[PDB]
Design an enzyme around this catalytic site. Sequence first.
Site, PDB file in Angstrom:
ATOM      1  N   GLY A  11       0.694  -1.224   0.130  1.00  0.00           N
ATOM      2  CA  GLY A  11       0.042  -0.042   0.096  1.00  0.00           C
ATOM      3  C   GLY A  11       0.851   1.169   0.068  1.00  0.00           C
ATOM      4  O   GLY A  11       1.931   1.076  -0.061  1.00  0.00           O
ATOM      5  N   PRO A  12       0.198   2.251  -0.004  1.00  0.00           N
ATOM      6  CA  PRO A  12       1.001   3.650  -0.013  1.00  0.00           C
ATOM      7  C   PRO A  12       2.018   3.988   1.192  1.00  0.00           C
ATOM      8  O   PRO A  12       1.644   3.571   2.367  1.00  0.00           O
ATOM      9  CB  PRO A  12      -0.097   4.760   0.107  1.00  0.00           C
ATOM     10  CG  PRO A  12      -1.437   4.081  -0.401  1.00  0.00           C
ATOM     11  CD  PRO A  12      -1.206   2.666   0.089  1.00  0.00           C
ATOM     12  N   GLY A  14       4.187   5.919   4.117  1.00  0.00           N
ATOM     13  CA  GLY A  14       3.991   6.833   4.756  1.00  0.00           C
ATOM     14  C   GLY A  14       2.787   6.510   5.843  1.00  0.00           C
ATOM     15  O   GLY A  14       2.334   7.379   6.370  1.00  0.00           O
ATOM     16  N   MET A  15       2.236   5.272   5.712  1.00  0.00           N
ATOM     17  CA  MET A  15       1.209   5.131   6.429  1.00  0.00           C
ATOM     18  C   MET A  15       1.827   4.371   7.957  1.00  0.00           C
ATOM     19  O   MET A  15       0.933   4.505   9.002  1.00  0.00           O
ATOM     20  CB  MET A  15       0.180   3.839   5.974  1.00  0.00           C
ATOM     21  CG  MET A  15      -0.816   4.453   4.863  1.00  0.00           C
ATOM     22  SD  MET A  15      -1.922   3.304   4.357  1.00  0.00           S
ATOM     23  CE  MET A  15      -0.755   2.200   3.690  1.00  0.00           C
ATOM     24  N   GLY A  16       2.998   3.932   7.963  1.00  0.00           N
ATOM     25  CA  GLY A  16       3.507   2.932   9.184  1.00  0.00           C
ATOM     26  C   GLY A  16       3.561   1.438   8.940  1.00  0.00           C
ATOM     27  O   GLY A  16       3.991   0.945   9.836  1.00  0.00           O
ATOM     28  N   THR A  18       6.077  -0.332   7.857  1.00  0.00           N
ATOM     29  CA  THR A  18       7.155  -0.826   7.919  1.00  0.00           C
ATOM     30  C   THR A  18       7.230  -0.826   9.651  1.00  0.00           C
ATOM     31  O   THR A  18       7.787  -2.178  10.060  1.00  0.00           O
ATOM     32  CB  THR A  18       8.239   0.263   7.819  1.00  0.00           C
ATOM     33  OG1 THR A  18       8.641   0.101   6.073  1.00  0.00           O
ATOM     34  CG2 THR A  18       9.816   0.025   8.448  1.00  0.00           C
ATOM     35  N   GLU A  38      12.592  -3.555   3.985  1.00  0.00           N
ATOM     36  CA  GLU A  38      12.554  -2.585   2.797  1.00  0.00           C
ATOM     37  C   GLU A  38      13.978  -2.592   2.440  1.00  0.00           C
ATOM     38  O   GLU A  38      14.924  -2.417   3.376  1.00  0.00           O
ATOM     39  CB  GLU A  38      12.151  -1.462   3.278  1.00  0.00           C
ATOM     40  CG  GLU A  38      12.378  -0.201   2.532  1.00  0.00           C
ATOM     41  CD  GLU A  38      11.916   0.973   2.899  1.00  0.00           C
ATOM     42  OE1 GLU A  38      12.486   1.782   3.242  1.00  0.00           O
ATOM     43  OE2 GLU A  38      10.407   1.354   2.639  1.00  0.00           O
ATOM     44  N   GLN A  80      12.322   2.955 -11.682  1.00  0.00           N
ATOM     45  CA  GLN A  80      11.567   1.931 -11.243  1.00  0.00           C
ATOM     46  C   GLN A  80      11.856   0.566 -11.394  1.00  0.00           C
ATOM     47  O   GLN A  80      11.671  -0.156 -10.594  1.00  0.00           O
ATOM     48  CB  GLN A  80      10.259   2.320 -11.828  1.00  0.00           C
ATOM     49  CG  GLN A  80       9.520   3.609 -10.975  1.00  0.00           C
ATOM     50  CD  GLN A  80       8.215   4.000 -11.518  1.00  0.00           C
ATOM     51  OE1 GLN A  80       8.007   4.362 -12.772  1.00  0.00           O
ATOM     52  NE2 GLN A  80       7.265   3.873 -10.854  1.00  0.00           N
ATOM     53  N   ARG A 166       1.006  12.536   8.570  1.00  0.00           N
ATOM     54  CA  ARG A 166       1.761  11.657   8.909  1.00  0.00           C
ATOM     55  C   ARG A 166       3.267  11.590   8.099  1.00  0.00           C
ATOM     56  O   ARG A 166       4.223  11.366   8.403  1.00  0.00           O
ATOM     57  CB  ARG A 166       1.061  10.069   8.975  1.00  0.00           C
ATOM     58  CG  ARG A 166       2.003   9.155  10.000  1.00  0.00           C
ATOM     59  CD  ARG A 166       1.830   7.829   9.676  1.00  0.00           C
ATOM     60  NE  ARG A 166       2.736   6.941  10.143  1.00  0.00           N
ATOM     61  CZ  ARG A 166       4.106   6.831   9.918  1.00  0.00           C
ATOM     62  NH1 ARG A 166       4.966   7.578   8.934  1.00  0.00           N
ATOM     63  NH2 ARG A 166       4.896   5.926  10.573  1.00  0.00           N
TER      64      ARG A 166
HETATM   65  C1  LIG Z   1       8.927   6.709  -4.983  1.00  0.00           C
HETATM   66  O1  LIG Z   1       8.835   5.975  -6.183  1.00  0.00           O
HETATM   67  C2  LIG Z   1       8.833   4.323  -5.663  1.00  0.00           C
HETATM   68  N1  LIG Z   1       8.594   4.241  -4.379  1.00  0.00           N
HETATM   69  C3  LIG Z   1       8.493   2.965  -4.094  1.00  0.00           C
HETATM   70  C4  LIG Z   1       8.133   2.839  -2.572  1.00  0.00           C
HETATM   71  C5  LIG Z   1       9.082   3.072  -1.647  1.00  0.00           C
HETATM   72  C6  LIG Z   1       9.304   4.590  -1.252  1.00  0.00           C
HETATM   73  O2  LIG Z   1       8.383   5.459  -1.831  1.00  0.00           O
HETATM   74  C7  LIG Z   1       8.886   2.319  -0.304  1.00  0.00           C
HETATM   75  O3  LIG Z   1       8.245   2.885   0.670  1.00  0.00           O
HETATM   76  C8  LIG Z   1       8.335   1.976  -4.807  1.00  0.00           C
HETATM   77  C9  LIG Z   1       8.023   0.413  -4.370  1.00  0.00           C
HETATM   78  C10 LIG Z   1       8.466   2.379  -6.309  1.00  0.00           C
HETATM   79  O4  LIG Z   1       8.370   1.214  -7.026  1.00  0.00           O
HETATM   80  C11 LIG Z   1       8.838   1.389  -8.538  1.00  0.00           C
HETATM   81  N2  LIG Z   1       8.808   3.733  -6.728  1.00  0.00           N
END
Ligand SMILES: COc1nc(C=C(CO)CO)c(C)c(OC)n1
EC number: 2.7.1.21
Lengths: 309, 307
Positions: A11-12, A14-16, A18, A38, A80, A166
């Site tokens: 999921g997104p 910055g939610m917590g 980890t 991570e 990416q 957050r």
């Molecule tokens: C920020 O860009 C980006 N963040 C992530 C995730 C992160 C950092 O934003 C782990 O929190 C991931 C998996 C990703 O995958 C391509 N691309």
Amino acid sequence: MPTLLRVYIDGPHGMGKTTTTQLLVALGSRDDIVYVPEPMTYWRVLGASETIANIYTTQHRLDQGEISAGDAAVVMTSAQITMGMPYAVTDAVLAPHIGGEAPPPALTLIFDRHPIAALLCYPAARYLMGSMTPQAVLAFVALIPPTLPGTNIVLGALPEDRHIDRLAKPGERLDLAMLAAIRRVYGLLANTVRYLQCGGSWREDWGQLSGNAGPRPHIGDTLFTLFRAPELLAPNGDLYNVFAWALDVLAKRLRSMHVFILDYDQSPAGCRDALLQLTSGMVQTHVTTPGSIPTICDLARTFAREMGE
Amino acid sequence: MPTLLRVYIDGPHGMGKTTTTQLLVALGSRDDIVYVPEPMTYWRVLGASETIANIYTTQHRLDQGEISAGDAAVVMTSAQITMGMPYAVTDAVLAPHIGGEAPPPALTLIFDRHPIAALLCYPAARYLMGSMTPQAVLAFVALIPPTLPGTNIVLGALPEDRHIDRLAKRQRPGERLDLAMLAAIRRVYGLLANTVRYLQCGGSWREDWGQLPRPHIGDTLFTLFRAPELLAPNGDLYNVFAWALDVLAKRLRSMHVFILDYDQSPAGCRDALLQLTSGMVQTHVTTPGSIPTICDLARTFAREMGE
Ligand SMILES: COc1nc(C=C(CO)CO)c(C)c(OC)n1
Ligand SMILES: COc1nc(C=C(CO)CO)c(C)c(OC)n1
């Protein structure tokens, strides 16, 4: 024949997620629950130079009108691919050890994110941000590895206002538009699995698009809605077949996933116990050999030592 | 269940790969052997605009010192995703129709290239040419689809001089005749062939790593990955890259390689390819409707992305 439980916390950001994960691993026994953390190390050093930083600088430049879409697109596509490499190898070395779907598991495996995070979710969000083409998003989609048995994916729920505060608390920049985009994406994703598990079929419902729990969502409420883009449409208005085939891959990959929703609008100990209760309804699997268990254990331990922050 | 023969025509481009194949589909029945051609329309229009041209212009600018190696790498990485997309989508929809290993097959499916061409071979050559990072190459390697049964791959043999000549006589749109690339891509494919043999005779890269009846690890693709970017300060590969090498090992070991001598007439090549098929491995399909589903896939692909 011993059993295995795998759980992907996703999921997104910055939610917590980890913290909550670490809190949960901490309650468990040393030798029956492991964390694949991570891989920030790969992100900041081993894979390349401050990948997170590079991504947010380029988006900001695109918005500021300092580079074009085409330029931002190639930067985002490269970074990416790199961001996702550790999830992809992990899935690949683990795959042979996973058996059929299957009483306490002889081993629990917790992951920080699942391959679709980097091969689908974030790409899709960058496309919404105008910094990635839908063709490239679909090329990532086409490379999603086969969904193994017992793929439990936990996604987060959190009010936007609280999510904003957050997160405002790498090299990241406060990009509210990005936050909104990734929030929308994970939302469509949870719908999509539900849509597919209720026998939904994107081909049969494709025309309806234009201007774990619950009922079947509308196709307009799933990820399929994103790829009604003119770049992907033939003259006759249909999807080119190559893109349709990648949507098929998407459905094949998502439909067999067990999605769980975790409420992050609570304390860190709260999320942890919430998560713990949530595991008892998750699908476990057998392993393929007796020695799969300690082998799986070494790999996860090896990974954390090298790549966890 | 009815049987299927999959044949991937691969190897470095410019040898005869396409002409040769076209003569073979001519011989067999139009509804007994099907062909999945080169997706030039995807490369030139659908996925992006003139991907080939973008690739070669970029190497050229890097060569002329007009852009940085860093700049080159991102473009190169991005464009090669575009090049590989049709190969990857095709494998992904075909996989569930493939059963176990299996008399003439019910259907013979011939492809222009296998997915490792775009996810391993070409990127590795670009790495040798300074325009891709070794991490990126390993990131592609990690995404190589699992090796299904009956994965028969035909690679080409041709002396470099004849190869230069034929490639010169048939550049693709936007392509620039480049002898460094040609030697890079020929070497990658030679290492590939040696890699498969090494693996098949029981080579273990982890065991023989120190050395950096089977080839020497120094004549396999594993030698390309001794790169400083992938090593810890004590000389060891980081585990993350080591795992990518285990994946490469697993994928390549169970492929079946056949070498086609291209140093002959296009009709000589066709006959050769045909005789090469007696040693290829067949599989069963999984459902009675697989065979026509596969046929329609093939014709649909050709119709849409063929030149
Ligand atoms: C920020 O860009 C980006 N963040 C992530 C995730 C992160 C950092 O934003 C782990 O929190 C991931 C998996 C990703 O995958 C391509 N691309
Ligand atoms: C020219 O660059 C390039 N060509 C090819 C293949 C061609 C020649 O352009 C068809 O033979 C492939 C597969 C590739 O994969 C990444 N990259």
